[PDB]
């Protein structure tokens, strides 16, 4: 129903970003919300048929607009580390008391002090224990994705060139490598469980890949290490006798 | 003009029916809305209730509205129902601007038919400098906690479904690049079942 | 017509292309409970008992916005069919029986109003009257026409005559309904 | 010249009968003086009154959430507001002023509610003709007025009285006149 662009947004402090939202066809009201851990789902601003309807506890830097095509734009200027939150958009028919709100998938913003601290993940596959295979006749492949910053990642398991979901479970939230640091690099684990016989087949190819979201081609980089661009990092393993 | 959700977070067992409360003190209510929210995803609409006495149903969910509060009755919950259930109010008191509650974080632990708790040492990668241990097949009553040991990292319980065998199991992963890293004392800070299988 | 002990409008929502102008009112048994001054962003009560209720003027502005949209849609639907001007029925009468040297209020009832845009001024002996003049809002009718009532707080004299001047598009010349004791 | 004007009206009408028992909600959608669509609580759905009604009526009938939110106003608007009316506008009792002035007219001035019963009596005797009662005059300031003209013959030894009944009075108000 309600659509939102972009999905992920990694930026620096002082930058300006623009968020878009296309409401449900037939809906003439659009609402903007900021969701953070310590403040919850907080209303920013509302529009009806291209005009401002309501203002929340919105900042001076934050500005919005509803075009004649009824889509909305939330412009966020002079960004601060605190602006790192989930920005949801909502759509309503007439914006009256009995109208039901319908939310969008939301843009996820991450404001960093500098782009220098951005690191892609280190993906490593770990083959199942011979003890587990001998005890349950089930084999667990563990995938470890370490040292990445920030946490805009998507982990997936691939058996013989195709994605798998059966016997797969990834941590809902990553760990902090240095929990005392506010800008700490992250770690994430995932498991792929198959039967002992399936893993025992050497013709079976297993691969764990992590999609990392980072800096785009237009961003600056002068450091000796390779630019941490949005990329795919992967580790693979074949079946053992 | 306020809206309050209780409990703030809830821990349930597969099948253990419970009820989520949403109390409100705003005046002139014209709509009460229940949402389901998953991490990083947008709020998924569930029910609308326009007046006290109303009751709506959607499979194992039942939303009722009264002059004082609204109940979201979740019957025989499955681990699929693990989300943050949000409650909002639209009333004359709050100028009809939606006032959302802080939500109820729901977590439904699965039922393990045959638990076989064990800690296994996985095959060391040729590229990685890390050693991995895995605590698996333990029942949902077992709670896993982070290591107190420097450079040792433990993940929380994670249930995987093997629908081909109508099987499901919980697992925690423990790793470290430290030389003295042994599985036998990796989950030392966790209360593990007294008869957990520790292979050689 | 629908027969009922009590009839109420919660409320009468009105919007027109002339101006443009809006009107939000609530009615109970043909009497105006209140109106919302959209320009002033204020709820104005017409009964002292009702005055303590909290009706947000925003809720009026909020509904009129939907009417603004709906009118645009129906101008496109009717192939732009303008409202027909109606001839209003003007009646002048006193609030209480006429007694010289005793306070009395003159009532000017302008019935069958369409479109709801009319001028109701008072005259005493030809000159215009500004002091002691008050009026109601456009009160709804089942035939979706209107009626507005204008008051005049006065002391009646043996030679003092009064006139109600009504200017409407449905009238070729301004209508004058004379009154005398 | 005639200035071009397009009018749109929306009326949320509640009809109350036998107190709280009989309740009906009628939301009328009007273009100029033409009501093209209306929801009726007794009917259950939006209906097209004129050929300008189906694009609106059908659209609002297609969505269950539009039907549910409209159907709810029979309780959230009608029954809700009636509870406020019972305490304010339905309690309003303004007693009338009865005067006889010259053939002979009984002026019943400023009263609430509308319900009234004016009767002339010849000498403890009714008088049906010639009675020319004016319709119930609405003053718009939450008061009503009614004038009743009586064709009489002034004759020796008869007392003419005007009997007026109203819910604000415990007993009828009687005002007499003599030749």
């Amino acid at each position: 129903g309600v659509t939102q662009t972009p999905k992920h947004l990694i930026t620096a402090t002082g930058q300006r970003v623009t968020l878009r939202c296309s409401p449900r066809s037939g809906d003439l009201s659009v609402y903007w919300y900021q969701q953070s851990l310590d403040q919850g789902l907080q209303f920013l601003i509302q529009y009806y048929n291209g005009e401002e309807r309501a203002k929340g506890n919105i900042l001076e830097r934050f500005s919005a607009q509803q075009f004649p095509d009824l889509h909305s734009e939330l412009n966020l200027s002079s960004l601060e580390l605190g602006d790192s939150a989930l920005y949801f958009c909502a759509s309503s028919n007439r914006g009256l008391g009995t109208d039901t709100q319908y939310f969008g998938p939301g843009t996820r913003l991450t404001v960093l002090e500098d782009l220098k601290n951005v690191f892609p993940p280190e993906v490593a596959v770990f083959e199942p224990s011979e003890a587990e295979i001998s005890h349950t006749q089930k084999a667990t492949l563990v995938c470890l994705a370490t040292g990445f910053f920030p946490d805009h990642v998507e982990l997936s398991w691939w058996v013989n060139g195709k994605e798998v979901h059966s016997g797969v479970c990834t941590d809902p939230q990553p760990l902090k490598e240095q929990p005392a640091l506010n800008d700490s690099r992250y770690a994430l684990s995932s498991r792929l469980r198959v039967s002992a016989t399936f893993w025992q087949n050497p013709r079976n190819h297993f691969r764990c890949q992590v999609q990392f979201y980072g800096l785009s081609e237009n961003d600056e980089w002068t450091q000796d290490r390779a630019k941490p661009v949005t990329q795919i990092v992967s580790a693979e393993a074949w079946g053992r006798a | 003009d306020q809206v309050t959700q209780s409990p703030e977070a809830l821990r349930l067992q597969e099948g253990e029916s419970s009820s989520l409360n949403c109390s409100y003190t705003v005046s002139g209510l014209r709509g009460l809305f229940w949402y389901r929210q998953d991490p990083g995803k947008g709020p998924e609409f569930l029910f609308t209730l326009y007046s006290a006495g109303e009751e709506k149903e959607k499979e194992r969910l039942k939303a009722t509205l009264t002059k004082k509060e609204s109940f979201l009755h979740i019957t025989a919950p499955k681990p699929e129902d693990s989300a943050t259930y949000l409650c909002a109010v639209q009333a004359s008191g709050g100028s009809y601007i939606p006032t959302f509650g802080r939500g109820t974080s729901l977590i439904v632990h699965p039922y393990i038919q045959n638990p076989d708790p064990a800690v296994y040492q996985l095959r060391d990668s040729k590229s990685s400098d890390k050693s991995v241990c895995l605590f698996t097949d333990f029942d949902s009553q077992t709670n896993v906690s982070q290591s107190k040991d420097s450079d040792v990292y433990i993940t929380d319980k994670c249930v995987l479904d093997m629908r081909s065998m109508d099987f499901k199991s919980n697992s925690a992963v423990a790793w470290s690049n430290k030389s003295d890293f042994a599985c036998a004392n990796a989950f030392n800070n966790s209360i593990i079942p007294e008869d957990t299988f520790f292979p050689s | 017509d629908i027969v009922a002990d009590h009839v109420a409008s919660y409320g009468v929502n009105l919007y027109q292309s002339y101006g443009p102008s809006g009107q939000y009112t609530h009615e109970f048994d043909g009497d105006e409970q209140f109106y919302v001054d959209l320009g002033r962003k204020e709820t104005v009560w017409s009964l002292p008992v009702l005055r303590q209720f909290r009706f947000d003027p925003q809720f009026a502005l909020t509904n009129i916005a939907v009417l603004k949209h709906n009118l645009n849609s129906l101008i496109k639907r009717s192939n732009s069919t303008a409202a027909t001007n109606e001839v209003p029925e003007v009646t002048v009468f006193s609030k209480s029986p006429v007694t010289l040297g005793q306070p009395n209020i003159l009532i000017c009832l302008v019935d069958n109003i369409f479109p709801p845009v009319v001028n109701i001024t008072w005259l005493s002996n030809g000159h215009s009257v500004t002091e002691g003049v008050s009026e109601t809002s456009f009160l709804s009718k089942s035939d979706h026409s209107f009626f507005k009532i204008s008051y005049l707080t006065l002391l009646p004299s043996a030679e003092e005559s009064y006139d109600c001047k009504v200017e409407h598009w449905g009238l070729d010349k301004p209508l004058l309904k004379h009154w005398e004791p | 010249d005639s200035p071009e004007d397009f009018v749109y009206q929306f009326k949320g009408m509640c009809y109350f009968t036998n107190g709280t028992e009989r309740v009906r909600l009628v939301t009328r959608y009007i273009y100029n003086r033409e009501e093209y669509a209306r929801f009726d609580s007794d009917v259950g759905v939006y209906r097209a009154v004129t050929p300008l009604g189906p694009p609106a009526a059908e659209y609002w009938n297609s969505q269950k959430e539009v039907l549910e939110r409209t159907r709810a106003e029979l309780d959230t608007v009608c029954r809700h507001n009636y509870q406020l009316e019972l305490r304010t506008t339905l309690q309003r009792r303004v007693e009338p002023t009865v005067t006889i002035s010259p053939l002979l007219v009984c002026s019943v001035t400023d009263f609430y509610p509308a319900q009234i019963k004016v009767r002339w009596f010849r000498n403890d005797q009714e008088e049906t003709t010639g009675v020319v009662s004016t319709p119930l005059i609405r003053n718009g300031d939450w008061t009503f007025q009614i004038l009743v003209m009586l064709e009489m013959t002034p004759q020796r030894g008869d007392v003419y009285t005007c009997h007026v009944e109203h819910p604000s009075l415990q007993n009828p108000i009687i005002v007499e006149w003599r030749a």
């Binding site: 008391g97 009995t98 | - | 919660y10 409320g11 609530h26 209720f53 509904n63 | 694009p55």
Partner: peptide, 11 residues
């Protein structure tokens, strides 16, 4: 205090 009827929106 008093409640109002909300008008439905055209296409």
């Amino acid at each position: 205090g008093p409640q109002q009827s909300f008008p439905e929106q055209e296409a």
